[PDB]
């Protein structure tokens, strides 16, 4: 159940980044 592709710092962080 992993969608998380370019994960990290881009989804979670998409808003900070």
Distance CA(3)–CA(16), nearest Å, equals 21
Radius of gyration of the chain (CA): 8
Q: Give 4's Cβ-side CA count (13 Å radius).
A: 10
Structure-token pair, residue 4: 């998380």
Distance CA(10)–CA(17), nearest Å, equals 7
């Amino acid at each position: 159940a992993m969608r998380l592709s370019a994960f990290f710092r881009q989804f979670i962080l998409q808003r900070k980044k």
